[PDB]
Amino acid sequence: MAYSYTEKKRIRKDFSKLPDVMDVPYLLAIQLDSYREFLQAGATKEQFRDVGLHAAFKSVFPIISYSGNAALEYVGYRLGEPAFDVKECVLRGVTFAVPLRVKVRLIIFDRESSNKAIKDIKEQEVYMGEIPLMTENGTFIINGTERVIVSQLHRSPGVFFDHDRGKTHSSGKLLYSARIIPYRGSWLDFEFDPKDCVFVRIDRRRKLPASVLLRALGYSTEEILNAFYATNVFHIKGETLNLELVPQRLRGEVASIDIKDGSGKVIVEQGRRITARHINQLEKAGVSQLEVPFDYLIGRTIAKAIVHPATGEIIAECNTELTLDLLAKVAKAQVVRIETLYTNDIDCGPFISDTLKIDNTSNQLEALVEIYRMMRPGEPPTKEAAETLFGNLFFSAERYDLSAVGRMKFNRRIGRTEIEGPGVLSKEDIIDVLKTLVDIRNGKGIVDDIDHLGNRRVRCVGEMAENQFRVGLVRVERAVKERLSMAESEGLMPQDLINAKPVAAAIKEFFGSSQLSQFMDQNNPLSEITHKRRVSALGPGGLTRERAGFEVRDVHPTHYGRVCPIETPEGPNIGLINSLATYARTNKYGFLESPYRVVKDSLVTDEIVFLSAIEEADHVIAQASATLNEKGQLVDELVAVRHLNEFTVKAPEDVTLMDVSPKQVVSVAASLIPFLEHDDANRALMGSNMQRQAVPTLRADKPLVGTGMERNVARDSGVCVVARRGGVIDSVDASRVVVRVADDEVETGEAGVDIYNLTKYTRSNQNTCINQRPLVSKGDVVARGDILADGPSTDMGELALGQNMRVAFMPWNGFNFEDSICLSERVVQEDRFTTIHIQELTCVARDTKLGPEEITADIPNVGEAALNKLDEAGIVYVGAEVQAGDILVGKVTPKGETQLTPEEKLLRAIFGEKASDVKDTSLRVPTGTKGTVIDVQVFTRDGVERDSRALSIEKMQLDQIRKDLNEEFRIVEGATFERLRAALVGAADDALNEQLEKAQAYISDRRQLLDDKFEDKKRKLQQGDDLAPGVLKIVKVYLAIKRRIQPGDKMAGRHGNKGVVSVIMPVEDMPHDANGTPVDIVLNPLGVPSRMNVGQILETHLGLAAKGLGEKINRMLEEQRKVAELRKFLHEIYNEIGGREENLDELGDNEILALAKNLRGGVPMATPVFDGAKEREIKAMLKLADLPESGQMRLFDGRTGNQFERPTTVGYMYMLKLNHLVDDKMHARSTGSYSLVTQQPLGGKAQFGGQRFGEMEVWALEAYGAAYTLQEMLTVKSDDVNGRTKMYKNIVDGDHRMEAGMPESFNVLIKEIRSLGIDIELET
Amino acid sequence: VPLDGGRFATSDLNDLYRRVINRNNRLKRLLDLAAPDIIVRNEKRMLQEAVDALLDNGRRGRAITGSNKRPLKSLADMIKGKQGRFRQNLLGKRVDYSGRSVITVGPTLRLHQCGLPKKMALELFKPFIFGKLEGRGMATTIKAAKKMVERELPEVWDVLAEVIREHPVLLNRAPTLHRLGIQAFEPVLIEGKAIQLHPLVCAAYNADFDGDQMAVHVPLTLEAQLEARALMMSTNNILSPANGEPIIVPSQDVVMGLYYMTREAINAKGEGMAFADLQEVDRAYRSGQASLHARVKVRINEKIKGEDGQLTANTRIVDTTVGRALLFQVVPAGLPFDVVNQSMKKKAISKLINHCYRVVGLKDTVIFADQLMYTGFAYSTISGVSIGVNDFVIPDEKARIINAATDEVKEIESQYASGLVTQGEKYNKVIDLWSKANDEVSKAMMANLSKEKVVDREGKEVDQESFNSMYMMADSGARGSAAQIRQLAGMRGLMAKPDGSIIETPITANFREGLNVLQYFISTHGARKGLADTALKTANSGYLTRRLVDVAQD
Amino acid sequence: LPSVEAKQKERDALAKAMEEFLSRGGKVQEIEPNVVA
Amino acid sequence: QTRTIRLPIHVVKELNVYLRAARELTHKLDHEPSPEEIANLLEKPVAEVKRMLGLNERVTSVDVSLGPDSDKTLLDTLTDDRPTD
Ligand SMILES: [Mg+2]
């Protein structure tokens, strides 16, 4: 294949065997697509009908004014431009917001039952709420700090049926309650009573009868009960002896009465089970009437009201059983018709027929009052008024929130035809809940699952932001409704009609005070990706941590390809916080989908369909590693399928779908682990979390054994700058890269120049270093998509989270006892695991009521050694080495009424120091932290007095902008000299001079923009920063610290093997081989058999062959070998072992020698998660680099010189350095400040508090005999004013016995009980 | 109290006390104006709920709620509601002379001592240095002695080394489940920021080296210093308080060096030679002229404590290996030689320390458990044991059992399509079938893993015990059991389900050969089921041990 | 909520009202954005 | 009977004027409340308006849980200046 500019420098050996039909899509597509639907920047006059920002204005604005003749009409909205750019926004503290101006008109009427004599006044209203306008990486810059808004996995609105059999029913078979869950509020319920009844309820009401809800809506009680279970009519010619023989109801019912039908034969004996042969006789016989007894119809109740034509009145009401006295009336009245209900115990029991007689609610008038009894008993509403009142209360569209997705899930579960149901409840839907709830008792079908991915909906930032904007709009209309009704249009303007405060305040709290909008952890480019693919089950309006349990914290068979099962955080919330898969994608309704390949019995089709969770149970899905016959046919008689969420084995003639890639099940962080199939699921879950906490080291080193997904994480994270358009690089600087756009990829009719400014050393959210280094040279061509400069922890476009060290697996003198890491001194002298940390220290100047706070250079009671580092303004210089305790900025506060002690003024006269009425409150560095001042930022009020340093920093910024504008015009000036000269020498004098006016018109129009851009930056430098009220000046400095690795730091690998370095041994003590090459890290082999992670050793065996091949390339390159011998050895590595590669496409003298120089340190290899190298392919490369195929060699002891009596596994393993350094873990305290009420230790004076002595440690001392050790830690070490001060005097004097006194926690308890009117004293 | 910027902050009882005084003075003024009973009965009613809301909240009198979300914090709410002052102190209280840092293994420390950084010792023992500088004459006042510690003068380190010589410190881990969670050690000054912990006390503390932290505490009075040495010392609590078995036993790394040392081989270098004493055995092994484990005959002088008060010595010629003779050099005098003639597994060493504690006492046992740690760490490094890709040997007869069991299920699936068996009858047929084939592979794997090492004695092919790395770690009891080696070499078997059922298709692959995409997704069901179960194991068991203390504390 | 169809029928009544006015005698006013009355 | 620190009747009468004049100005046209633009509407000096608005006590409560988690109180984190170490 053809290689780009970046791929020609270094190629990874890919061991993949399965072909890829679809590559991995954009990782951050879930954050960008959901926001473009909400915020529609690029659109025509006709907007979209989505649920974003346009749906909010289309639902709150068009409302007429009550008790008036006015109405507001929404026309459209437009988005302006942000005041500041992206990078210049994180340092000023702005929100990078954009205003929106909605054009709303005001209409007037005459209230004459006709909209006449109107006057439209279209006015572009001022900005209501500034939208944060997230960047291109999926982050929101809120108050200078970029944040992400994770998606929420909430339950979809609809109906849910289950068993819910527990201890309440005290039996196996139980009926569950169908709790209808709307979108917001107006909850409903329907519980089935155990006594063959149904008792509906509400969110806060008690059990309500279901019989009164049928007649109050308008339906008759006789017709609703006859259509529930069954309906049977019988004719009577003066004698009620007849039964309508039902071919379905008579099958399975015993007949206790002997019948003689059949013209001389018997059908059923006295109490005999009828068979299928005798049942089918009634069909071909054609008979319908039969002589039935009178004692068998006493159990069968009537369905509809029986009216006699002779009497003229209803002789029998509905739902009435037959008695002995009621039988003589039928013989006397001689009714021509009879309607009874035919129910049995084998079929479904008529629970609606028995519940109809509950509370005597069958009539239409008596049922409308029973509902009002549960909603509002004894309210001001009348009997008939409450019926019409309640009929419109829950029918309100604003009260009963039912989304479009909820209406689809409502009709699809009950089996209705109309999928897009209305927002209000329909009478046809109330009848499906009755037939489906009673069916779940007898077990004639299936139930629903509340944990399946079909019942869970993914809510992104586009919906969470539109809901807050909708709430902000209904808060404006409620306040502007009374102002418009009592006024007119000719006296005011549409701007003064409504207020824009509730809208700006509703979106201000969603991005700054919501648990979904959290600070993005950018200590690693991988952590930024996994934070945006994160799907959280917590949040507002969702399932919390306490009500989780154990049924939701597990995996489901529907999580295959949608949610990674080995990426849950271990702790209090495991299984609630999930991460999206690699190929996963949300549907239109908000459900997760995964791609599949349509496979037939003759050819696997090339089309790819994205299937949801509910559509997966129909088809048959096979694995992606199924064998093929090079023609699209499966060559295996037994394939693995999951057609019905069951991992079974079936025939290749029944498969219908096929997976795209084996990596579609794991997430992004879980796919970066080589040999994942060999590690346990418990270690793989821990290996994907520790890989996220890696700190970017000083030098980025690629992993010799990788997967292949590393070039996709670094490209989609955005930490490295890529080329927008192709062209030739003009000039490369350490701070910026400018490229010359090619002649073909230009949109306009000019040359075009792209300038990329590289980010230098800046502070991250985790106090880490972030900087970019150029990778291109001067004079090389690049294409669209090439990496020009890599970011933090990236090696030439790949992902380099750590470094690969020479690891030996053996016990070494107990230093690697359990999980400790025996380190060498070479990894410390070579600065391998050294990291740079940037710390920010701010000093604010407030306005004390006694006097303002100003930054000065005069400090009382100090010397010259403390003021030499400051300047004439009072701030340290950039680049000064500050130790622990140095003064950064000068700040003094005026004091009054000091009341100096007369014993103190005698001591000040000894030296002669003058008395100054100013308290020293300067900003100093904390104890134990040292660094270098790298940047100082000064912020002041708009128009306030600035010091000398404020303009000094301003002068440097005004020159760097001027130096960039001069470089922009310098490159475009040379393009006008080569284009005009080439056409003058090559091939009418009037036409030659006419084109000069057009060429000079473009260089003059660009020059005008340079002046507008220069005056824009000069104006922004003069704009004072708006801060909190009560602050005068804010000065913040930045300290850079280079922390090396020391015994105590936590290191880990990619296979879930963490540890803490214990000792740093010299090079002479480390075990070495016969050649004298010492190892770098000694690991303990006892951990591998305990936690089954074989991929830890397979990476070590493959890493030895990767480094061994680089030593052969180096030896071949140093011996001045010809090019024909280099490409021959490169073909033996890529095109001989496995996988598939391609050579003979690059130039030997310039592009092959450049490739062999990057492979000098080692040949990187790609091992996918489930499509990697085997044990045979690993040993094939071990014998190629002249290494043992076993991967083990006999080492020598460095201290004694003797050779080890057993071969030891050696190799190169990729190690990571986690953010668990001991510089923030080591703490100690003797004395310090105490609290106000309870005299207990605490922090706040640049020092931590103490160690909390809980009750578990008290029981440990009580289990011992230490009575004086327990009393000492409870009285003299805390809560004793006279105990701590007198014990400190004893330790200095020499003796120490005890000072018990009385704890302050008990002295306060006595004063609090006495204040409650309860006397408590000490009897003694 | 005021705050930064002139803002004040008060408590929830000032407005409650002010509301009662505002209504009490209003009632006192309403009585002298001869007001009728219609207006004075309502003011006396307001004074009722005014004092009632001050005492307690949540009763029939609703508490005042103005410009605040939480209702209020009354007088009774200060001693109840899971946050009262009486209950908040029973669950924790900050103390002085304390600190914390990560733990680190120290293999050169004794059982009664631990490592303490110099930066922590200067802060923990600060008052003891101020009193030692004035008594020695280096400082006149306490204000001048404090400035000497900030400058870190060289003479301060000589003072700090003397104030911690016989002063023990207490170390405790955050989860204190039993009595051994707090033990006293003699701190030594080490360079670094990590607390150096003894490898043998890691079993009682239940502490691994994955970044765990351990808090420190300093006993001040000599009454508390004697309780840390006589009661809370690490050498005193060598036995478990729940059983009679030793809690300080050699862990996986120490028991691995003692198992390889005492492991008899068939044919080795220096086999059959005789030694006059145990000192000749070490002299022959250090010269490289004798293997670590070879059948030899050494004359040994041992003493017997079986006789009451008679420590009689006996000289006999035994037939043992070279490694077992070197291990007898650290055994005390009261024990015979038959206690070290075995293979020295983990269960055999714990029974030797328990027998040594009941014979020679405690002083000769705390110095004997330290010698086993030094001898286990020394001989586990000489033998560079390592796990490789060829250590997980696969039995050649595993394919003959999997392919045979797969054909026995195909003949059953044909009977399911013919109507001979039902769904429940076929379920119990395929579940019990794979469970039989899983035990057949496990017994065929351990037979090939344990008796594979072959040797040559004067010309032969004799089968001995396997000298394999994966077999040694499971036989010695260091780390791993039969259920874990089964998943590395043999088949994994049938996996469970969070619902409680067993899947029909088992995992016929191991971790060496690798799993498929569907076989790996099935194993994730029981993985997160066991991880989420640990969250309940710390919440339910902690509630049980708390209820048991509240009953049997007196 | 008022999300979609709660007030949709009212929009058609107001849209048809302005169509009759804009047919004959219909005028549009270009009011400035920042106006107090 | 409203505020904790009682204000005399002679300074509390003129305080409601600054609070009533600040309400009408903030709602003029998309206006933000500030103490600079209110000094011109009432013809008050810059140092006088900063004292009238700052005279409002608006005391807070120390028995409030700081943050989303209700596990720490503000009073338990306060220190004293009169007592020493
Ligand atoms: Mg740990």
CB contact under 8 A, D54 and A849: yes
Q: Which amino acid is at A129?
A: G
CA–CA dist A1170, A1185 (Å, integer): 26
CA–CA dist A840, A737 (Å, integer): 28
DSSP A557: G
Residue A174 to residues A163, A196, A439, Cα–Cα distance (Å): 6, 11, 12
Question: What is the A1222 CA–ligand 1 centroid distance (Å)?
Answer: 15
Give strand pairing partners of A706: A1166
Q: How many CB atoms lie within 10 A of CB A609?
A: 13
Contacts of B25 in chain D (CB under 8 A): none
Closest chain A CA to residue D33? A1029
CA–CA dist A709, A688 (Å, integer): 14
**Phi, psi at A531, each rounded to 5°:** -75, -25
Residue A684 to residues A521, A689, A1099, B147, B450, Cα–Cα distance (Å): 22, 9, 14, 53, 30
Selection from B87, B98, B89 nearest residue A1249 by Cα: B98
CA–CA dist B112, B185 (Å, integer): 5
Say if B175 is an interface residue toward chain A (CB within 8 Å).
yes
Selection from D16, D54, D17, D12 nearest residue D35 by Cα: D54
Question: What is the A1151 CA–ligand 1 centroid distance (Å)?
Answer: 49
Contacts of B70 in chain D (CB under 8 A): 64-65
Say if CB B64 and CB B18 are below 8 A apart.
no
DSSP assignments along C1-37, one per residue: --SSSTTHHHHHHHHHHHHHHHHSS---EE--SS---
Query: With breaks defined as C to next N over 2.5 Å, after which residues does chain B break?
Result: none
Residues 110-139 of A with CB under 8 A from D: 126-127
Question: A988 CB contacts (<8 Å, ≥6 apart)?
Answer: none
Please, what is the angle between helix B363-382 and helix B346-359, to 10°? 150
Say if CB A678 and CB B514 are below 8 A apart.
yes
Mutation choice for D interface testing from B70, B82, B88 by most D CBs within 10 A = B70
Burial A666-689 (b: 16+ CB within 10 A, else e): bbbbbbbbbbbbbbbbbbbbbbbb
Beta-sheet strands, E only, within A8-139: 13-14, 63-64, 70-79, 100-108, 121-124
CA–CA dist B227, B161 (Å, integer): 22
DSSP A238: S
Question: A42 CB contacts (<8 Å, ≥6 apart)?
Answer: none
Please, what is the angle between helix B252-261 and helix B363-382, to 10°? 70
Ligand-binding annotation for B32, yes or no, is no
Expressed in angstroms, the distance from the first to the final Cα of chain D is: 39
CB contact under 8 A, A681 and B520: yes
Expressed in angstroms, the distance from the first to the final Cα of chain C is: 33
Contacts of B100 in chain A (CB under 8 A): 1225-1227, 1251
Give strand pairing partners of B233: B184
Selection from D58, D52, D57 nearest residue D22 by Cα: D52
CB contact under 8 A, B192 and A1048: yes
Question: What is the B208 CA–ligand 1 centroid distance (Å)?
Answer: 4
Resolution at which this structure was determined, Å? 3.1
Option in D59, D65, D80 nearest B9 (CB): D59
Element (H, E) at A1315: none
Tokens for A838? 């940037």
Say if A1029 is an interface residue toward chain D (CB within 8 Å).
yes
Distance between D81 CA and the closest CA of chain A, angstroms: 9
Distance between A115 CA and the closest CA of chain C, angstroms: 6
Option in A60, A491, A494 nearest C2 (CB): A60
DSSP A1035: E
DSSP A1150: I
CA–CA dist A855, B408 (Å, integer): 88
* Chains touching B by CB (3 or more pairs below 8 Å): A, D
Selection from A881, A884, A695, A1043 nearest residue B193 by Cα: A1043
CA–CA dist A705, A1104 (Å, integer): 10
Say if C34 is an interface residue toward chain D (CB within 8 Å).
yes
Option in A575, A623, A1277 nearest B528 (CB): A575
CA–CA dist A257, A269 (Å, integer): 7
CB contact under 8 A, D79 and A495: no
Tokens for A1012? 């507008």
Give strand pairing partners of A592: A586
The SS3 call for residue A937 is strand
Element (H, E) at A138: none
Ligand-binding annotation for B439, yes or no, is no
Residue D43 to residues A1029, D15, D19, D39, Cα–Cα distance (Å): 21, 15, 15, 6
Tell me whether strands B296-304 and B312-320 are parallel, antiparallel or unpaired.
antiparallel
* Chains touching D by CB (3 or more pairs below 8 Å): A, B, C
Q: Which amino acid is at A749?
A: G
Tokens for B494? 């049938």
Q: Tokens 């090939």 correspond to what residue?
A: B448
The SS3 call for residue A599 is strand
Tell me whether strands A736-741 and A727-732 are parallel, antiparallel or unpaired.
antiparallel
CA–CA dist A577, A703 (Å, integer): 29
CB contact under 8 A, D57 and B8: yes
DSSP B2: B
Selection from C21, C26, C27 nearest residue A114 by Cα: C21
Contacts of A121 in chain C (CB under 8 A): 29, 31
Say if CB A1137 and CB A1177 are below 8 A apart.
yes
Distance between A88 CA and the closest CA of chain C, angstroms: 29
Tell me whether strands A657-658 and A621-622 are parallel, antiparallel or unpaired.
parallel
Sheet containing strand A881-882, edge to edge, reads A835-846, A1031-1043, A931-940, A881-882
Tell me whether strands B274-275 and B296-304 are parallel, antiparallel or unpaired.
parallel
Q: Which amino acid is at A706?
A: G
CB contact under 8 A, B8 and D5: yes
Option in D1, D63, D78 nearest B12 (CB): D63
Contacts of D60 in chain B (CB under 8 A): 3, 7-10
DSSP assignments along B5-71, one per residue: TS-BEE-TTHHHHHHHHHHHHHHHHHHTTT--HHHHHHHHHHHHHHHHHHH-SSSSSPPP-SS-SS-
Distance between C13 CA and the closest CA of chain A, angstroms: 9
Q: Which class for B410: exposed (0-12), middle (13-18), buried (19 or more C-beta within 10 A)?
A: exposed
Say if CB A755 and CB A738 are below 8 A apart.
yes
Question: B419 CB contacts (<8 Å, ≥6 apart)?
Answer: none
DSSP assignments along A725-768, one per residue: S-EEEEEE-SSEEEEEE-SSS-SSSS--EEEEEPP-SEE-TTS-
The half-sphere exposure of B545 on its side-chain side, counting CA atoms within 13 A, is 14
Chains B and C touch, using 3 or more CB pairs below 8 Å: no
Contacts of B8 in chain D (CB under 8 A): 4-5, 57, 59-60
Tokens for A421? 């149901």
Structure determined via: cryo-EM
Expressed in angstroms, the distance from the first to the final Cα of chain B is: 43
Question: A609 CB contacts (<8 Å, ≥6 apart)?
Answer: A595, A596, A598, A657
Say if CB A163 and CB A176 are below 8 A apart.
yes
Helices (H), A246-335: 276-279, 281-285, 327-333
Tokens for A1303? 């704890």
Burial B441-472 (b: 16+ CB within 10 A, else e): bbebbbebbeeeeeeeeeeeeeeebbbbbbbb
CA–CA dist B335, A1142 (Å, integer): 72
For residue A74, the Cα-to-chain-centroid distance in whole angstroms is 35
Residue B429 to residues B415, B423, B426, B500, B519, Cα–Cα distance (Å): 12, 10, 5, 18, 21
Selection from A752, A751, A740 nearest residue A776 by Cα: A740
Provide the phi-psi class of A905: left if phi over 0, else alpha when psi is between -120 and 50, else beta: alpha
CA–CA dist A580, A633 (Å, integer): 32
Ligand-binding annotation for B210, yes or no, is yes
For residue B482, the Cα-to-chain-centroid distance in whole angstroms is 22
Closest chain D CA to residue A493? D29
Question: What is the A1070 CA–ligand 1 centroid distance (Å)?
Answer: 26
Question: A35 CB contacts (<8 Å, ≥6 apart)?
Answer: A134, A461, A462, A465
Distance between A1028 CA and the closest CA of chain B, angstroms: 12
DSSP assignments along B280-348, one per residue: HHHHHHHTTSS-SS--EEEEEEEEE--STT--EEEEEEEEE-HHHHHHTTSS-TTS-STTSSS---HHH
Size of interface A-B (CB pairs under 8 A): 432
Q: Tokens 């002085």 correspond to what residue?
A: B96
Element (H, E) at A60: helix A53-60
Element (H, E) at A1100: helix A1095-1118
Question: A1070 CB contacts (<8 Å, ≥6 apart)?
Answer: A824, A1078, A1079, A1080, A1082, A1198
The SS3 call for residue A152 is strand
CA–CA dist B298, B275 (Å, integer): 5
Expressed in angstroms, the distance from the first to the final Cα of chain A is: 96
Mutation choice for C interface testing from A57, A65, A69, A115 by most C CBs within 10 A = A115
The SS3 call for residue A1120 is coil
Chains D and A touch, using 3 or more CB pairs below 8 Å: yes
Q: Which class for A967: exposed (0-12), middle (13-18), buried (19 or more C-beta within 10 A)?
A: middle
Mutation choice for B interface testing from A927, A1049, A1269, A1285 by most B CBs within 10 A = A1269
CB contact under 8 A, D30 and A1234: no
CB contact under 8 A, C37 and A491: yes
Q: Which amino acid is at A1105?
A: A
- Cα-only R_g, chain A: 41
Question: What is the A1065 CA–ligand 1 centroid distance (Å)?
Answer: 23
CA–CA dist A466, A39 (Å, integer): 9
Q: Which amino acid is at A1252?
A: R
CB contact under 8 A, B11 and D60: no
CB contact under 8 A, B386 and A1209: yes
